[PDB]
Design a protein around this ligand. Structure first.
Ligand code: SF4
Ligand code: SF4
Ligand code: SF4
Ligand code: SF4
Ligand code: FES
Ligand SMILES: [Ca+2]
Lengths: 588, 905, 145
């Protein structure tokens, strides 16, 4: 049985535990290609089910995702409960190495769910986004305001009846919003932001803006300060909202890949990988070994690129302005290889449904060998010159520290999670794309996640990625770069150019789109900045019915107020430098 | 019946085959040679499924689902591995000889063969040998021929010969060298040849008119519309690209036209793309023609109309119900005139009275195929109401259908039905001034003048019922033919009487009403059909008004000093000299039209109205069904200087500017509400389509496919800034892809058929409740009137027989599908298909005048000595001259008129 | 279907020849001597059957010429791997019930019997490797394993 086969996961012990606790008629098991047990729960039992899952002997400790779905236009809902809308909750048990998706059905008139924030504190921003884009209210939310769109926005854009395209520009509304920006500070009240006890008459409220662009993007933080100390802060995000999920409903399965590239714009093929894996699950495609090795090599090259930018920008944020020049030279060596292979630098859009766009060009191994010879001396030089400097250490060690429990309750993944001692990397826990055939280690911290431990963990991750790249260079399999499946999009170009049935398949795949049979698929990968996941719902058409992108930077930015409370503003900017986020990842 | 497909239970009709039953259930089985309207023949072998004897059977056997009845307790599997392998092998065998042609093939993106190649999963070629090749034929100006792409599915010949009764298309050769086409190069002679471009699943037969300005299906902007070229009211999907009307596709209406159009509707759309159309309001100031915008045109027209002492309005059967009503409201009911002549108005109102007061049910176009005997009186149906002629051919094949049903043959086994029937057919009797295209299947044809055809109808009615008035002076041979018709009509379970206004005779319609009444009095399930002239002839008849002669009298006497002519060239309904003199006498002529007509030279103001592609409205077809047509595209999207509005919008704004000195562009639903409030006989046009607030789960209905391309480049040469999406306040459709076109959406107006995996016209299967039936949530369009409880009295005005007077030549109308309709004859592709102008003569009359075939003779009508070449008509009765109605220079009002000094030029 | 020397001691009845893997047919038997190449004989038979197709239904009309071309290639030693598997698949998919009439099952009976009994002669015509494509300069091919 292939890994993409539709399964109900009734053999999962969590299904038997839920049946013993709540009864057989309390929930409905849905068969998916998500790889996880999908369980439809009544709305009135959601908090009970969540508490039961949190109190299991090997408990579900992290709320991985929480979002909504407009099911009104979905025609293939066989075996599913009646629902105009739905809200899903993806929960992860690291100790079990398992996960469960809970789905709550909602009628159009009764669009309210109990809040999940008492069980999982990252449900705050997840429910705010679900309210913003779908109009689903969450009862008991401390402050349920829009998080992506401005507060004076009409409608909920992820609803199926909301038009996707840009509306006509108007200078009058730009003038009005400029006036709101001008008198935003004059009419600032802490109550609408969730802040309290401000203006005591000792705290000040200070807004941060687009004044420190360290390649992360534009966003705002309003800080409540007792003198120099942060007593509370909320981040203002949505300034980088691109409507990428709505675009997922707007593009074909093939023509959405460039948009996947720009979700986390320092990641490239890393961003492409979960989307094409989830589409290949929908299509029932198993890629050959050469495709797996090529995709792993591209992912690790882009992981090294992103880590180089992250480490150098952290060093620049601390104050040492020199290593960014050399690290971008190393990024140019990576770009030499990536340009030669894919034809592009930052957004290659090179992965395909069923494979990659072209075969490897002749001479790729020379460029890979040159980069693998160039990198280690440069990395050691950066370590000795900057990361072992005691001023940088005094600026970063012990700054914005959190443990394993705080990382689990906020959905922190990647190096921030592993610096707390939790050994959870997707490439080892849930292997994908042939990562199990590579010899590499997962660096973990001592139990405490500071700025410094996160940065050094990413340095060790860079070294491990260099090891994986060495293995990719030494053992690259001979074979096809595209699968021999009819839904491989596009087909191999030479057969398209001389064979009529292949030309027909190409013609219909690039124009109307490949038809993905109606299913739900999920793919989780270890991205550059944490765990990135694609959750795709196909309604049997050539476009996605729903494209949900879970990004780790959203969770990290939500964790910011809990970790930085009681610190200084300098600690905050160092913390932002050490998070490894981009605003495109946060806002999608 | 109960079937089990892949272990799932389904309830189906046992009289259906497994292919149409499984397609009606939403299951996907690839198929080529089967069509819902043509039956099953089992040729292509694509539709293989695995049938098991019972539930406890694992072996099974491969069967053709189209040839297998969907009987009770039938166990089949579609997703069986051997069935999937065989279906892929059938696609592969078709692919061995198929040309590498998809980029340069007009079927691409709309091709059933492409869809089934992808559906079977065949994408790898292992055949390595040569491909067979064919030369192409020239098939005329409408259909392009490319025999390389043929998969030998036999759909074309089955449709063209067995369905449409065409004679000049066939299959030649044998084995893998079978050829589909004409026996030699020439134009396809069938009036329904254009349906080949949708019947053929490949790109062999393609739309040449679309091929000139070709674009793919995903790039089209579609709207549900009604064909404007005659009164039948076939549902169409016009598709536009880059501001020009590109194609007319068939829009499935299970009540009216189902799968098929006629060639006039399919190819006569070219007048929309004419470059001489008015695009802006133009005011004639002396010898100058200045261009106005909408507001100042309204202000100037309103000022001049306010200064006038009496304003009259002249409507047209070309215009919609809303436009004619808006003109009637602008000028007043007592000042409103229908644009047709007095005799045409009398015939149209008599046909209307027979339809909605005769007590006899009038069938829809699909229902015509279920009648057991047909009498056509006077109306050359193939040239005037062509789709009715196609339906009549199906009703004629009903006898073979009944004979095969007596022998327990399934209704989809079409070859067995045709073999059992042989040449047997239901009785058909056609009367005309000459031969018709229905003479090949008619049991009898009566070639006679219109008075003699009416007398034959009156005699048939009298022999059916003695209370009907008798006819004196019937010859014994004609009496024997009358008796043959009488026993054929009396023995029929469902007789159908077809007539219309195109014969130019009131007595023909009266005789048809008498025959229908006599059949109704005997307890028969009789139906009556009236063929009108134009798309909204019945709507103009229901609205009523004075004739064009009265309007010209008002203009000539000086009682009216302002005339507003709506969508009427005025020369088809009255003599051109009288019209020109009356319009020159009037100090204000305003012409609201979308075509450059001859009366615009003397017009003081010309309002650039919208054609059907750029407008919304309602039209009433020949059976009284109100149907809404929706705007296809915004004419101002590319050319921002284009001020081309709906006629009702122009006239409503003119009325508002005349009354309150303020402009009011209004909304379509407001005008429809005004129509149904003021005219109760048109109250059913409210329910022809839902209003503009209708939504499918909150979203509008999309006009263009979801893969519509070039949004940020199609207007980039004009400006790199993308314009605002055109807003549609009038209807529930949006001028974008951001809308709903799901086959399961609860609606009746479908702009185009597309489903995932079905890009061809076969997606209409997904849009239907059952395949070949109706649309899933009802066919659009409602009937204005029900059958009345009581009928009319017998018409006692039996005319005298035709007598040839010396020196006077009675004009016999000859209609042409390509040429008689005004707008379609303006289409450039129709000029090659148009017959050359002529005059038909009896051999005795031509010998008396000393002329041969081809000699040019001259005649004077209303002081216009015009010269035409003579051709000899064998079937025309002496004392008559055959003239082609509706052509250039020959108005349709000349039918039934008389000619003087007809002599050799 | 072809039969061997071991089937010569079989009564000429419908039932006896039917269970031997053949048909009684017209009962006018044809003897094939050792000097006759089986591939050329089946090529002659399939050429007759393909050109006598009435052209109504796809498997016979478009699959018998494919078998003809494969047998012609095997005759001159131009066969490629997968040709015999293609012939066997054509025999399976042109059997009874798959085509509109019984012309094509009769057409594929001698082909399948000759492959069953004389497979060494059909394998001897496979000399060249499989090549359905030519190289296109600038496009690297997808090398399937
Ligand atoms: S008929 Fe269809 S498959 Fe053949 S060339 Fe045209 S689009 Fe391609
Ligand atoms: S020309 Fe078209 S409809 Fe006719 S047999 Fe060939 S593929 Fe079928
Ligand atoms: S029969 Fe009349 S309404 Fe129908 S397609 Fe032809 S011209 Fe148009
Ligand atoms: S199997 Fe029979 S019906 Fe089919 S093409 Fe061959 S000879 Fe004709
Ligand atoms: S559709 Fe049944 S054999 Fe052609
Ligand atoms: Ca409109």
């Amino acid at each position: 049985e292939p890994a993409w086969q539709t399964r109900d996961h009734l053999d999962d012990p969590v299904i038997g535990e839920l049946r013993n606790r709540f009864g057989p008629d309390a929930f409905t098991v849905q068969a998916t290609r998500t790889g996880v047990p999908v369980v439809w729960i009544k709305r009135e039992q959601l908090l009970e089910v969540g508490d039961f899952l949190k109190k299991l002997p090997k408990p579900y400790v992290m709320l991985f995702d929480l979002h909504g779905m407009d099911e009104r236009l979905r025609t293939h809902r066989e075996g599913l409960p009646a629902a105009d809308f739905s809200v899903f909750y993806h929960l992860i048990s690291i100790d079990r190495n398992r996960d469960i998706m809970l789905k709550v059905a909602l009628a159009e008139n009764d669009l309210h769910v109990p809040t999940f924030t008492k069980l999982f504190p990252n449900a705050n921003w997840y429910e705010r986004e679900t309210w913003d884009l779908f109009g689903i209210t969450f009862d008991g939310h401390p402050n349920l305001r829009r998080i992506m769109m401005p507060q004076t926005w009409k409608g909920h854009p992820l609803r199926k009846d909301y038009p996707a395209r840009a509306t006509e520009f108007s200078p009058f509304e730009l003038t009005k919003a400029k006036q709101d920006l001008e008198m935003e500070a004059l009419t600032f009240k802490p109550e609408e932001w969730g802040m309290k006890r401000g203006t005591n008459e000792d705290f000040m409220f200070l807004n941060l803006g687009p004044n420190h662009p360290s390649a992360h993007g534009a966003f705002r933080i309003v800080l409540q300060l007792d003198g120099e100390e942060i007593v509370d802060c909320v981040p203002d995000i949505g300034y980088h909202h691109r409507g990428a999920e709505k675009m997922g409903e707007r593009q074909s399965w093939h023509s959405y890949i460039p948009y996947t590239d720009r979700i986390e714009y320092l990641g490239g093929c890393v961003n492409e990988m979960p989307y094409v894996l989830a589409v290949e699950k929908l299509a029932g495609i198993t890629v050959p070994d050469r495709v797996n090795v090529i995709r792993v090599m591209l992912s690790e090259l882009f992981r090294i690129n992103s880590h180089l930018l992250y480490i150098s920008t952290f060093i620049q944020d601390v104050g040492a302005m020199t290593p960014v020049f050399f690290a971008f030279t190393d990024r140019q060596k990576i770009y030499d290889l990536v340009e030669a292979i894919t034809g592009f630098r930052m957004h290659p859009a090179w992965f395909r449904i069923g494979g990659v766009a072209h075969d490897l060009p002749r001479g790729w191994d020379r460029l890979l060998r040159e980069f693998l010879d160039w990198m280690p001396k440069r990395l050691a030089s950066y370590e000795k010159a900057a990361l072992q400097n005691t001023i940088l250490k005094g600026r970063s060690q012990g700054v914005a520290a959190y443990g394993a429990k705080e990382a689990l309750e906020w959905g922190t993944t990647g190096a921030g999670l592993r610096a707390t001692g939790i050994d959870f990397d997707v490439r080892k826990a849930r292997p994908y794309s042939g990562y199990e055939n590579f010899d590499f280690e997962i660096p973990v911290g001592g139990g405490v996640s500071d700025c410094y431990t996160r940065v050094m963990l990413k340095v060790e991750e860079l070294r491990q990625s260099l090891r994986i790249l060495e293995q990719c260079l030494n053992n690259m399999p001979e074979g096809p770069f595209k699968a021999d499946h009819p839904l491989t999009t596009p087909p191999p170009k030479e057969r398209t150019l001389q064979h009529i049935e292949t030309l027909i398949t190409h013609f219909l795949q690039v124009s109307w789109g490949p038809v993905m049979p109606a299913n739900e698929s999920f793919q989780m990968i270890e991205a550059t900045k944490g765990i990135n996941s694609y959750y795709l719902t196909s309604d049997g058409s050539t476009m996605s019915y729903r494209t949900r992108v879970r990004t780790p930077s959203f969770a990290h930015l939500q964790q910011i107020p809990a970790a930085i409370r009681g610190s200084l503003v300098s600690d905050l900017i160092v913390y932002l430098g050490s998070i490894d986020f981009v605003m495109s990842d946060v806002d999608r | 019946a109960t079937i089990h497909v892949d272990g799932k239970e389904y309830e189906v009709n046992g009289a259906d085959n497994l292919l149409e039953a499984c397609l009606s259930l939403g299951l996907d089985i690839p198929y080529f040679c089967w069509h819902p309207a043509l039956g099953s023949v089992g040729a292509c072998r694509q539709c293989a499924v695995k049938q098991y004897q019972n539930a406890e059977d694992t072996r099974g056997r491969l069967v053709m689902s189209c040839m297998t009845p969907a009987s009770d307790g039938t166990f089949i599997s579609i997703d069986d591995e051997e069935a999937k392998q065989f279906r892929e092998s059938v696609v592969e065998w078709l692919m061995t000889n198929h040309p590498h042609d998809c980029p340069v093939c007009e079927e691409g993106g709309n091709c059933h063969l492409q869809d089934m190649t992808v559906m079977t999963g065949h994408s790898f070629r292992r055949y390595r040998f040569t491909k067979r090749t064919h030369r192409n034929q020239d098939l005329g100006p409408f259909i392009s021929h490319e025999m390389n792409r043929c998969i030998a599915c036999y759909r074309c010949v089955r449709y063209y010969k067995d369905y449409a009764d065409g004679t000049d298309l066939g299959v030649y050769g044998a084995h893998d060298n079978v050829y589909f086409g004409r026996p030699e190069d020439g134009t396809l002679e069938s009036e329904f040849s254009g349906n080949l471009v949708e019947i053929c699943p490949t790109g062999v037969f393609t739309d040449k008119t679309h091929s000139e300005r070709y674009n793919r299906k995903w790039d089209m902007q579609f709207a549900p519309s009604i064909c404007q070229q005659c009164s039948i009211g076939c549902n169409i999907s016009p598709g536009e690209r880059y501001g020009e009307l590109r194609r007319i596709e068939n829009r499935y209406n299970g009540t009216v036209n189902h799968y098929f159009l006629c060639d006039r509707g399919r190819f006569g759309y070219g007048y929309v793309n004419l470059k001489d159309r008015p695009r802006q309001p133009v005011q004639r100031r002396g010898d100058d023609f200045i261009t106005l915008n909408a507001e100042q045109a309204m202000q100037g027209a309103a000022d001049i109309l306010r200064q006038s002492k009496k304003v009259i309005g002249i409507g047209s059967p070309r215009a919609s119900v809303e436009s004619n009503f808006a003109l009637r409201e602008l000028v007043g009911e007592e000042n409103f005139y229908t644009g047709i002549a007095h005799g045409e108005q009398e015939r149209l109102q008599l046909a209307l009275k027979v339809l909605r007061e005769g007590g006899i049910y009038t069938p829809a176009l699909r229902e015509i195929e279920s009648y057991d005997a047909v009498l056509v009186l006077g109306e050359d149906v193939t040239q005037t109401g062509a789709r009715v002629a196609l339906a009549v051919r199906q009703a004629v094949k009903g006898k073979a259908r009944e004979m095969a049903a007596a022998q327990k043959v399934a209704d989809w086994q079409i070859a067995a039905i045709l073999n059992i029937g042989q040449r047997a057919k239901h009785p058909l009797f056609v009367t005309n001034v000459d031969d018709t295209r229905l003479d090949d299947i008619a049991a009898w044809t009566y070639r006679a003048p219109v008075e003699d055809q009416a007398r034959l109808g009156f005699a048939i009615a009298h022999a059916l019922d003695n209370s009907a008035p008798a006819v004196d002076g019937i010859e014994p041979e004609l009496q024997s033919k009358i008796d043959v018709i009488v026993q054929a009509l009396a023995g029929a379970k469902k007789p159908l009487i077809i007539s219309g206004t195109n014969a130019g005779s009131l007595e023909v319609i009266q005789a048809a009403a008498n025959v229908a009444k006599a059949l109704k009095g005997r307890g028969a399930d009789v139906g009556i059909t009236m063929i009108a002239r134009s798309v909204n002839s019945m709507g103009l008849g229901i609205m009523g008004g004075g004739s064009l002669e009265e309007a010209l009298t008002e203009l000539e006497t000086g009682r009216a000093d302002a005339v507003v002519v709506l969508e009427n060239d005025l020369h088809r309904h009255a003599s051109a000299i009288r019209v020109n003199a009356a319009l020159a006498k009037a100090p204000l002529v305003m012409v609201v039209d979308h075509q450059r007509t001859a009366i615009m030279e003397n017009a003081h103001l010309v309002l650039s109205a919208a054609s059907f592609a750029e407008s919304d409205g309602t039209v009433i077809n020949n059976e009284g069904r109100a149907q809404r047509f929706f705007q296809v595209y915004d004419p101002a999207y590319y050319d921002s200087k284009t001020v081309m509005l709906e006629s009702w919008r122009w006239l409503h704004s003119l009325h508002s500017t005349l009354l309150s000195r303020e402009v009011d562009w209004t909304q379509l639903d407001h005008v429809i509400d005004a129509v149904v409030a003021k005219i109760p006989e048109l109250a059913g046009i409210k329910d022809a389509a839902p209003d503009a607030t209708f939504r499918i789960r909150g979203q509008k209905l999309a006009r263009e496919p979801h893969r519509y391309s070039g949004r940020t480049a199609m207007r980039a040469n004009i400006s790199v800034h993308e314009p605002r999406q055109p807003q549609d306040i009038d209807t529930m459709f949006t001028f974008s892809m951001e809308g709903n076109n799901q086959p399961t959406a609860h609606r009746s107006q479908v702009p185009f058929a597309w489903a995932p995996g079905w890009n061809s016209p076969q997606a209409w299967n997904k849009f239907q409740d059952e395949v070949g039936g109706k649309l899933r949530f009802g066919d659009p369009g409602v009937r204005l009137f029900e059958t009345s409880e009581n009928g009319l009295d017998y018409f006692t005005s039996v005319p005298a027989r035709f007598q040839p007077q010396d020196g006077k030549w009675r004009i016999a109308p000859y209609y042409h599908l390509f040429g008689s309709d005004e707008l379609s004859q303006r289409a450039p592709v129709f000029q090659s298909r148009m017959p050359q102008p002529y005059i038909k003569l009896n051999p005795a009359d031509a010998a008396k005048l000393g002329v041969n075939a081809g000699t040019r003779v001259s005649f004077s009508y209303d002081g216009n000595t015009v010269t035409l070449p003579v051709e000899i008509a064998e079937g025309l009765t002496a004392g008559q001259v055959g003239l082609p109605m509706g052509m250039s220079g020959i108005a349709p009002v000349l039918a039934g008129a008389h000619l003087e000094d007809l002599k050799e030029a | 279907d072809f039969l061997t020397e071991a089937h010569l001691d079989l009564p000429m009845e419908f039932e006896s020849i039917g269970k031997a893997g053949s048909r009684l047919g017209t009962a006018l038997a044809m003897a094939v001597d050792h000097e006759i190449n089986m591939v050329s004989l089946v090529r002659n038979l399939e050429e007759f059957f393909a050109r006598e197709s009435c052209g109504w239904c796809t498997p016979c009309r478009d699959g018998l010429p494919w078998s003809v071309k494969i047998l012609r290639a095997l005759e001159r030693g131009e066969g490629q791997p997968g040709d015999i598997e293609t012939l066997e698949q054509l025999c399976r998919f042109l059997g009874p019930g798959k085509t509109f009439c019984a012309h094509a099952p009769g057409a594929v009976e001698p082909l399948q019997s000759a492959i069953k009994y004389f497979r060494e002669e059909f394998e001897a015509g496979i000399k060249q490797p499989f090549s359905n494509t030519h190289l296109i300069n600038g496009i690297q091919p997808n090398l399937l394993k």
